[PDB]
Amino acid sequence: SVMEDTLLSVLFETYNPKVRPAQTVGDKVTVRVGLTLTNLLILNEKIEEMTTNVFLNLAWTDYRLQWDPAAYEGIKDLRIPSSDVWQPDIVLMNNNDGSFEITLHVNVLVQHTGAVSWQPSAIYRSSCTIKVMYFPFDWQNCTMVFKSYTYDTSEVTLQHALDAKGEREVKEIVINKDAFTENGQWSIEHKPSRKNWRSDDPSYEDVTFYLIIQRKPLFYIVYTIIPCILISILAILVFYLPPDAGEKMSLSISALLAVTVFLLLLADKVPETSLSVPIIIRYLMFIMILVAFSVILSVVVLNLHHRSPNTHTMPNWIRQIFIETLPPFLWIQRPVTPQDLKEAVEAIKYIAEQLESASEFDDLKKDWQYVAMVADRLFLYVFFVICSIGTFSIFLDASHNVPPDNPFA
Amino acid sequence: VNEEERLINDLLIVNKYNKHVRPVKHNNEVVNIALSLTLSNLISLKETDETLTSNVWMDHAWYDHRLTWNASEYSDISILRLPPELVWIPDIVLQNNNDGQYHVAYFCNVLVRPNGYVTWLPPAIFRSSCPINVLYFPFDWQNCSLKFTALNYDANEITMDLMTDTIDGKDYPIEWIIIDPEAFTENGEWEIIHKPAKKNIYPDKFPNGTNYQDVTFYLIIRRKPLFYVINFITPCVLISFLASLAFYLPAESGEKMSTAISVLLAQAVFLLLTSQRLPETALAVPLIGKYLMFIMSLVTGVIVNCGIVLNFHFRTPSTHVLSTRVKQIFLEKLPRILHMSRHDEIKSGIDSTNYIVKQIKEKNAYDEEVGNWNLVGQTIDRLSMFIITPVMVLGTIFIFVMGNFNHPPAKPFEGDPFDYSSDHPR
Amino acid sequence: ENEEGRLIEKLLGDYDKRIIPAKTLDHIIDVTLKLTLTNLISLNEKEEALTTNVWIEIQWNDYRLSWNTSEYEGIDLVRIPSELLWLPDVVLENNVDGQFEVAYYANVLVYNDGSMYWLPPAIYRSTCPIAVTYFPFDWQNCSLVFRSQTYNAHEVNLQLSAEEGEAVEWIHIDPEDFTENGEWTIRHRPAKKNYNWQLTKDDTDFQEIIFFLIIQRKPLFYIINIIAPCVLISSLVVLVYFLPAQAGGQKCTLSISVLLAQTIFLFLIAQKVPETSLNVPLIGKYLIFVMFVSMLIVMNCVIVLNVSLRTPNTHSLSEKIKHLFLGFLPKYLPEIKSCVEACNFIAKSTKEQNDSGSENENWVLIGKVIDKACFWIALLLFSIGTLAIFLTGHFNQVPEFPFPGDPRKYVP
Amino acid sequence: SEHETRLVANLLENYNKVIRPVEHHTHFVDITVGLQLIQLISVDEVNQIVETNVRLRQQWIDVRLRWNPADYGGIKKIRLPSDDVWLPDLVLYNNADGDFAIVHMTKLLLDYTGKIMWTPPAIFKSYCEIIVTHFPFDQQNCTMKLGIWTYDGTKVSISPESDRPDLSTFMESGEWVMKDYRGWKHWVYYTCCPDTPYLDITYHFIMQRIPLYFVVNVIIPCLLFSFLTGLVFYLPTDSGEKMTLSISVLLSLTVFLLVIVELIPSTSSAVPLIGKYMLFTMIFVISSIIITVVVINTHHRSPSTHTMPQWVRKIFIDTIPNVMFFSTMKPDVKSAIEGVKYIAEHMKSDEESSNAAEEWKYVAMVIDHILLCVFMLICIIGTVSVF
Amino acid sequence: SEHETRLVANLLENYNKVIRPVEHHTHFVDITVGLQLIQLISVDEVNQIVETNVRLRQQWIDVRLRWNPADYGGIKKIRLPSDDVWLPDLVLYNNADGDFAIVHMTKLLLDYTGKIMWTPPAIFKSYCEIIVTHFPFDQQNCTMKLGIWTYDGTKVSISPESDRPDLSTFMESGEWVMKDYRGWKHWVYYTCCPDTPYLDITYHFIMQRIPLYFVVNVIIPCLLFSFLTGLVFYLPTDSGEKMTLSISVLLSLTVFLLVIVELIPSTSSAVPLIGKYMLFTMIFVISSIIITVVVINTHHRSPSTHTMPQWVRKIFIDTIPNVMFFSTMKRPDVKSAIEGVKYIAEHMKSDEESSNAAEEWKYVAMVIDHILLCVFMLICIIGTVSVF
Ligand SMILES: CCOC(=O)c1cncn1[C@H](C)c1ccccc1
Numbered sequence A: 001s002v003m004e005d006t007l008l009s010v011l012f013e014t015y016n017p018k019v020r021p022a023q024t025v026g027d028k029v030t031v032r033v034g035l036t037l038t039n040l041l042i043l044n045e046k047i048e049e050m051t052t053n054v055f056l057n058l059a060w061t062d063y064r065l066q067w068d069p070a071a072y073e074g075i076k077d078l079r080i081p082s083s084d085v086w087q088p089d090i091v092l093m094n095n096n097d098g099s100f101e102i103t104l105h106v107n108v109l110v111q112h113t114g115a116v117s118w119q120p121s122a123i124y125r126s127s128c129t130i131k132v133m134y135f136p137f138d139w140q141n142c143t144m145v146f147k148s149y150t151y152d153t154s155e156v157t158l159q160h161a162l163d164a165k166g167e168r169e170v171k172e173i174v175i176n177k178d179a180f181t182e183n184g185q186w187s188i189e190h191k192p193s194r195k196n197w198r199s200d201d202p203s204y205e206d207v208t209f210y211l212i213i214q215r216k217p218l219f220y221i222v223y224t225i226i227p228c229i230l231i232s233i234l235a236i237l238v239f240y241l242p243p244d245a246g247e248k249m250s251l252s253i254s255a256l257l258a259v260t261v262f263l264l265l266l267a268d269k270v271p272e273t274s275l276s277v278p279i280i281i282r283y284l285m286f287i288m289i290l291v292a293f294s295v296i297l298s299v300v301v302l303n304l305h306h307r308s309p310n311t312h313t314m315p316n317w318i319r320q321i322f323i324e325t326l327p328p329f330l331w332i333q334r335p336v337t338p339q340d341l342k343e344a345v346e347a348i349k350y351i352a353e354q355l356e357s358a359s360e361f362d363d364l365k366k367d368w369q370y371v372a373m374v375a376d377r378l379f380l381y382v383f384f385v386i387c388s389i390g391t392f393s394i395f396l397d398a399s400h401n402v403p404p405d406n407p408f409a
Numbered sequence B: 001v002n003e004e005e006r007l008i009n010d011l012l013i014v015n016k017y018n019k020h021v022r023p024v025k026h027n028n029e030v031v032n033i034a035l036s037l038t039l040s041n042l043i044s045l046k047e048t049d050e051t052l053t054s055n056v057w058m059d060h061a062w063y064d065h066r067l068t069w070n071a072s073e074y075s076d077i078s079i080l081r082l083p084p085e086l087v088w089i090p091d092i093v094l095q096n097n098n099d100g101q102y103h104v105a106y107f108c109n110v111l112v113r114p115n116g117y118v119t120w121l122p123p124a125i126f127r128s129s130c131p132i133n134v135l136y137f138p139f140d141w142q143n144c145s146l147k148f149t150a151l152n153y154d155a156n157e158i159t160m161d162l163m164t165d166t167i168d169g170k171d172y173p174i175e176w177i178i179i180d181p182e183a184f185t186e187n188g189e190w191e192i193i194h195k196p197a198k199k200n201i202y203p204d205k206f207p208n209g210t211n212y213q214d215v216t217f218y219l220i221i222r223r224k225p226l227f228y229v230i231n232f233i234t235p236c237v238l239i240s241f242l243a244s245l246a247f248y249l250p251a252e253s254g255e256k257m258s259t260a261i262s263v264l265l266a267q268a269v270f271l272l273l274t275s276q277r278l279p280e281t282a283l284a285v286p287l288i289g290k291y292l293m294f295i296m297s298l299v300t301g302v303i304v305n306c307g308i309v310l311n312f313h314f315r316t317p318s319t320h321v322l323s324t325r326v327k328q329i330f331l332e333k334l335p336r337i338l339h340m341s342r343h344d345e346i347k348s349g350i351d352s353t354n355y356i357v358k359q360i361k362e363k364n365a366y367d368e369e370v371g372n373w374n375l376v377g378q379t380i381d382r383l384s385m386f387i388i389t390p391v392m393v394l395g396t397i398f399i400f401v402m403g404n405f406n407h408p409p410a411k412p413f414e415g416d417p418f419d420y421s422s423d424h425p426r
Numbered sequence C: 001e002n003e004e005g006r007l008i009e010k011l012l013g014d015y016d017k018r019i020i021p022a023k024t025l026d027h028i029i030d031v032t033l034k035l036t037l038t039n040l041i042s043l044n045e046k047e048e049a050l051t052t053n054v055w056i057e058i059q060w061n062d063y064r065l066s067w068n069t070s071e072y073e074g075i076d077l078v079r080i081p082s083e084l085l086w087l088p089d090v091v092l093e094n095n096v097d098g099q100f101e102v103a104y105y106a107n108v109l110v111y112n113d114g115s116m117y118w119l120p121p122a123i124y125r126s127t128c129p130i131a132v133t134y135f136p137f138d139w140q141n142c143s144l145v146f147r148s149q150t151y152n153a154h155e156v157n158l159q160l161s162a163e164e165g166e167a168v169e170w171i172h173i174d175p176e177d178f179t180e181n182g183e184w185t186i187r188h189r190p191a192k193k194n195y196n197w198q199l200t201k202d203d204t205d206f207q208e209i210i211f212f213l214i215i216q217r218k219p220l221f222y223i224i225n226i227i228a229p230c231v232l233i234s235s236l237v238v239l240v241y242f243l244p245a246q247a248g249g250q251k252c253t254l255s256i257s258v259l260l261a262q263t264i265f266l267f268l269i270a271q272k273v274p275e276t277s278l279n280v281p282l283i284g285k286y287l288i289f290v291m292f293v294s295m296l297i298v299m300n301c302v303i304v305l306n307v308s309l310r311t312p313n314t315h316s317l318s319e320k321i322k323h324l325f326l327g328f329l330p331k332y333l334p335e336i337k338s339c340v341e342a343c344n345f346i347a348k349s350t351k352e353q354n355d356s357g358s359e360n361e362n363w364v365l366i367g368k369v370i371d372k373a374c375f376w377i378a379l380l381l382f383s384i385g386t387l388a389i390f391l392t393g394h395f396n397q398v399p400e401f402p403f404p405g406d407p408r409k410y411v412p
Numbered sequence D: 001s002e003h004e005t006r007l008v009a010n011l012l013e014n015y016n017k018v019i020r021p022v023e024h025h026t027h028f029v030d031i032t033v034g035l036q037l038i039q040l041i042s043v044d045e046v047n048q049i050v051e052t053n054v055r056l057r058q059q060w061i062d063v064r065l066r067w068n069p070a071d072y073g074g075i076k077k078i079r080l081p082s083d084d085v086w087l088p089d090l091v092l093y094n095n096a097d098g099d100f101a102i103v104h105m106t107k108l109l110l111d112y113t114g115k116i117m118w119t120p121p122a123i124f125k126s127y128c129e130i131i132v133t134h135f136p137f138d139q140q141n142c143t144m145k146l147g148i149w150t151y152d153g154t155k156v157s158i159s160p161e162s163d164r165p166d167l168s169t170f171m172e173s174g175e176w177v178m179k180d181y182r183g184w185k186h187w188v189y190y191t192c193c194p195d196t197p198y199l200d201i202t203y204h205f206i207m208q209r210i211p212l213y214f215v216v217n218v219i220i221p222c223l224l225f226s227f228l229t230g231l232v233f234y235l236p237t238d239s240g241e242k243m244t245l246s247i248s249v250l251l252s253l254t255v256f257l258l259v260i261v262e263l264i265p266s267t268s269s270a271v272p273l274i275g276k277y278m279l280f281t282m283i284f285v286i287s288s289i290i291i292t293v294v295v296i297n298t299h300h301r302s303p304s305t306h307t308m309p310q311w312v313r314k315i316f317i318d319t320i321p322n323v324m325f326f327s328t329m330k331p332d333v334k335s336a337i338e339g340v341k342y343i344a345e346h347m348k349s350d351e352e353s354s355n356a357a358e359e360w361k362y363v364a365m366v367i368d369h370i371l372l373c374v375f376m377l378i379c380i381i382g383t384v385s386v387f
Numbered sequence E: 001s002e003h004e005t006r007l008v009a010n011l012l013e014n015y016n017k018v019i020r021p022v023e024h025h026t027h028f029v030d031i032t033v034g035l036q037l038i039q040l041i042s043v044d045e046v047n048q049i050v051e052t053n054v055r056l057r058q059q060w061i062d063v064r065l066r067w068n069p070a071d072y073g074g075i076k077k078i079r080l081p082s083d084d085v086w087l088p089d090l091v092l093y094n095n096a097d098g099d100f101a102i103v104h105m106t107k108l109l110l111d112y113t114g115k116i117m118w119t120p121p122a123i124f125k126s127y128c129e130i131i132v133t134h135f136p137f138d139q140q141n142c143t144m145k146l147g148i149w150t151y152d153g154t155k156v157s158i159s160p161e162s163d164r165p166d167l168s169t170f171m172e173s174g175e176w177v178m179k180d181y182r183g184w185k186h187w188v189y190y191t192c193c194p195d196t197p198y199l200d201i202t203y204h205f206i207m208q209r210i211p212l213y214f215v216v217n218v219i220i221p222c223l224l225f226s227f228l229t230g231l232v233f234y235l236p237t238d239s240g241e242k243m244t245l246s247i248s249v250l251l252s253l254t255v256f257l258l259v260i261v262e263l264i265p266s267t268s269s270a271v272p273l274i275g276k277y278m279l280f281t282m283i284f285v286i287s288s289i290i291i292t293v294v295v296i297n298t299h300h301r302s303p304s305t306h307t308m309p310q311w312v313r314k315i316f317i318d319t320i321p322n323v324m325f326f327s328t329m330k331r332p333d334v335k336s337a338i339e340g341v342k343y344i345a346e347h348m349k350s351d352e353e354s355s356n357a358a359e360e361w362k363y364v365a366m367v368i369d370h371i372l373l374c375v376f377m378l379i380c381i382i383g384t385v386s387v388f
């Protein structure tokens, strides 16, 4: 185009893109900062970093890029490569890696009045402090802080982008339904934008975009919580087995090892911060300690069940507590209870005495076994109550955690 | 001397070519950029990363009236190669990429014909974002798209389009990704079912700006599941059936609980691996995940019921009473329903003999009760087997048949009758 | 104003960065190398790469950049950015990644006689084929190969730096700037100029400068955290010969547990060494050997259990077996009539049961004898293996001289 | 050198690096392309990507860069930056992760007659189809397709320097062996551009894996744990350890199958023979566990409820045992009188019940011996056939 | 701006960025270097690399860039691209994984008197000598050494802004605590160059780890299994489960040791206290397995083949049990029929003798178990008191 080339040659004859456009010394340049989110790619909790694919909607005015459309056959606007005009060095200040600037350098749109519009694109890694108190039933509050790296408040004034009609300001991240990809693990609840100042630094100002996002915890439920509930059921079961089965330690130790493995694997998905303990980890530790005490009490029960008068003498307090008082309360009462001829008589009498002694010994052994059974029943009830109450309480507390109706920003 | 040097110097230097100005006579005119995509290799599709890596050749074609010459004036030069950093090219960008690669990385020359037709066919490795539907894994089919937009100009200045072709004098648009039957490498895991290409327009926006149009190339691919079936599903199913088999062990073996617990722990290991192999999305629970949860719950029931059986087997008259109701329930009715099989010295001697007899009779009665409790336990575990194992087999068959009866819909764009296939142009 | 301005303006005006500074046609540029090591960052065994923080010092002579000090107020040294000068494209040839050049393109010091002194820092990732035969008591012999990427031996003559008239044939290590690694100790650090005689003086690959790092691993960490637990756990198999051979003895439980533990330790060792197939690590050979031994012990436990639990009903104890296993091998280590009939029957039955029990006890004793013999055999095997491995590992010493043929020490 | 500086200033004064180096536009440029493999960085089997460190030796004649040595002090050769002169655009078609063309623009050697020698380094991360049938004793054949991207055969023609690439300076892998290597030139017709031919040169390397890492770390443990399969049948049921041992064997086998699975690509083209062996072993082990549970259930069969049918007594107690040879198997006084008779009768009944129980135990023993013999037969035929 | 455009055109018209900004070549450029720590990205203990987010504030005078404000409409400050003026090649000596110098060339502020202020950003991946001896309660002290690479102290002089780096806008880590931080200027005299001073500034930060995370996720399970260690001695031998418990504990402790080693560098300079405790526990668990195998062997000793020696009986049945106070231990045809009854009685007598011998052996085994339990409890008490 002859006339567009002529206009370009006229505009940029003496235009210096390193000089901020200020018609008169002391003038400020109003820069409007908006943001459009196209895809909330990742939120890496291990490194506390949020990756987003966004457009950065900027707009300002350059008095030097002015012309009369009539003198150039009615050319209202131009698309000029962004490297040719001055732009404010608007960057993401709270990035995690070193990438400050934008990725894609699209053309700017300069209108005959001097209004410059520039909507670059970038993949930003922004550092986001993560609160783990309620992981995985947690909502995060991740921010992206944009400001001019170079110019301060005495040189550029930051404002909010205008809407499509150009009537009112847009105080929130813009989402284009035709170009937005739902994350699938996070749902966006609030997305306000707000200007921020520092009291001690009059030369500071930035536009911050907030993303209040709530995790959808189905994955963690299915793959971590239900298996631990089944393991806890087994741990409670261990106290219903009879000590004669010979499989009490197998069951209890297996439950303990399984829950420990679950904790170890889950340690890879939570941040290594130390400000609080996630609810999932608290539940896992609670179950682990409960199962360890299950192992210890099972060993105690086995020790009680394998005692005999030849080795132990039942003390009075054990008999008083476990034979008489508890069983009524636990509904586990037991049911209520000539030379040769002379030699032959002696032999029969010896056999009878042997049988009588054996019966008394067996009665005492049975008393010890009954003590073991009663203790095991008491432990069963106590552990069932504790496990149910603890699990229900922990997950009820987790369930009453939703982002506030007011973003406060 | 090479006439090409004279021609290029005439085109780019004498005529004052400006590579930052659209190639149009008048400002209000529009530029048509024809577009097509050739897939040379479907490198991978990481479900954990929700990324599709593809090796493609992205074809562009427009008209530049400033790069036109009379072939007779110069030697019969019917074509010319120029580097893209010397001429105007349209910066079409992949909008849905995971990384910062918005457009081709190798800028190859452009072919210019004497009539001004410019063609540009650079290669590219694109890492686009493809949401994964894990609902039917590993019998799933994915629907990944590559969305290309023109951000440097608005729809009033350049118009994206689909490359046209001729066969018998009528131009038909190319609504598919081009696959060369010999320059294409079939992927081991995925096979391409549909590959339409569509030019989308969004009427709620305006031609003022750069969100009014795009060209999207879709790629519907089905996973070949033999690998997972052989290496993940068969071992899991067999180990699961071992649990139901654990009902048949006698309580005197001392290994019922161990067998059931081993099966449960194996199921948990398989569940953990399945978790490792999929994205952490909450749209749906994978089919294999549902099966594993169901079978783990069922095996936990098996463990609890083996525990109850054991507790019943070790009862004795010294601690429990075999009531008549339980006796008739578990020794008369259920076994038939379940088809289960079936002078002073003389006085002292006499008193001692009587006492011995009494003790032996008591011991025999005690053993009789113990045997009755044993039979009760056997009845309980037989009933458990007949109640649980059918549920296990039916659930397995249902789950792994519903997944196998899951096919791509044979036509993309449900509301569209067109096949979008290379063999039948529109 | 700064007099260096006009000096540098005269030097760099009419100066082609692309032309080798050869005075005449047969002149050859003597490029001089000296490597200074400041930190041995790591040695990635899986990736078979050594990362080092070095300063490489390169010196040559460029007759074009020479002035007359008296003309410029006695300025005898200027700094010029390296991107404005001709450089000998000295690169690390044996890098793992594509990084050939140096990390930071520093300034070049230029003296009035033309001398060029360039000391860029670099983080070099170089290939080092790793020998695993003695892990974790191994010592590695890693090298850094430097050669010109552009010019051949007819243009550039690579040489080692000469300091005070005596050649510097080692990697320089400055006590001020040096952090000892903690896992590796440097024993030798020689340098030499090497020729590839398969190529002529052309071909750009004829001449090399190779800096060697012979580093010895400190093995305490691996001894404490891997080897000692592995050996202690593996020694537990022999205990299965003292557990009773019956239900609840748990011979097979202990045996299989130790077998699985050894397999896990084998996997762990596998995660710590490269996947090269030129040799099997020593600890890997030990683990395979003890796995085989413990599999044999599992079989032996099964055999002992099968022998001990035999009954006269199924298997009949012969006289040969009895004599052998219980002989020499242990050495080396109306109404009244009915009542009478009933009493006779009772006595007979009791006697029969007692005899059956006695036969069972005989079988149990045979089993115990087999247990003791196999225990001694297994302990012998295990001790021999462990001692062999210990000896082989503890006797691997780094060579006394950097190059076995040469008698020189290659130290400052 | 003043002479070299003047020469280089004269050569590039009116040189246009955009035009082809041909006297007439109808001629074609002959480029002799030769590949030099410096190292084989890795072969990522899971991702099917082969990372190599090569040098791409290229030669051609630029008639515009010729000079007479007499006028420049007898200079016969010079080195010029690659960015100052025309270069051919070679592209690696089957790139997978890296760069399509050369990115390290090193200097090139220019002869006084115009001949150019350019040997830039590269890191080719090319796609490699992995056949896992014989893993870890497999050999891999995958290639490097090189050709001119933008110029057809009538404008720029490429021919190979030699029939095979150059492995003179190849660094020994330590994980693969270069069985063979060859380079072939192809004329192809693409659907883009059906009128004119496009040339390319494909270099391929037959790589043989050295099977010592995986034999030590995978196969030997697999075999050792497989050989424990038979021990289940030799373990007496009274030991109370059959299920423990068999379940341990099965779980170890499946863990090893998973480990093998992590080392190969997820492609469904073919199944590894090692994996198929492991699957067969697992199926037999599960059958063994089923039969072991049947054996255990039989060994504890109470005679009270179960009566041994004739069809099992005849077969398992009278037929198989004789067949098999290798084994070594086979007032007050009135009450007192009444009580003694009761005791005698109860002992007789107990003896009968014990005889029945021992018959069941014998049946179990013969069953597990039959299974042991079947296992030995399978082992013998397998070890003979493999050899 | 027209005035600013003219000013920038005049400033750089004959300005050479290769020349030091000094009036006379004998002077030196006074550069005021100040480090501002924005964020502590990570501390990779395995690789011994510390990643930080910093801004490297630098100030100096360039007389060639001065102007009179009255001639340009009163402009007193401009912003020039840093690629247009002389910059000091300030380099991080102990770089480990990143770039040595500044790579993000941002604009710099320039007063009308020549005073320049340049505050570029950087990610410093420096080397940290990690000392794991109190992990996870450890304190790490590792630094960042900066200096001018190619100029000596007589040409370019660097001085710190203040005794301490600037942490006004520091982002709280949540994993480490900034106990202390200082910056020191060093004059070195190398051997290459023994006549001139080589300047250097070294910033160091004393980081104190916050241990809650590692406590909860590593130590508590390790301690729990350690406390399960001695439980086997209370398990009766008739249960037939001692090997299960002992081996499970041993393997759990081994797994936790392997978990801990992958959390620290492989250096042999020092051994972590937690790992040392874990190995001590493993040694005692191995001893427990051996001694409990001995106990199991004793418990099933056959009375027929073995006869209890007198010393064993005296030690383990007559003296030791009294010592334990808290325990509940204990301290024609008719002729044949008559002969059969006599046989029954004799066999019962012999069986009773044998069973009493066996019960004596079992009592000895239980006493050994209980001695070992009390010894392990003594170790528990002494360790708790001494350490805690
Ligand atoms: C200072 C070491 O203290 C301990 O190990 C210590 C203190 N309380 C408990 N333990 C452990 C469990 C222990 C007890 C007995 C033997 C070995 C280890």
Ligand SMILES: C[N+](C)(C)CCO
Pocket (backbone or CB within 6 Å): B121, D148, D149, D150, D190, D192, D193, D198
């Ligand atoms: C040779 N290709 C067909 C691949 C590209 C032509 O530009």
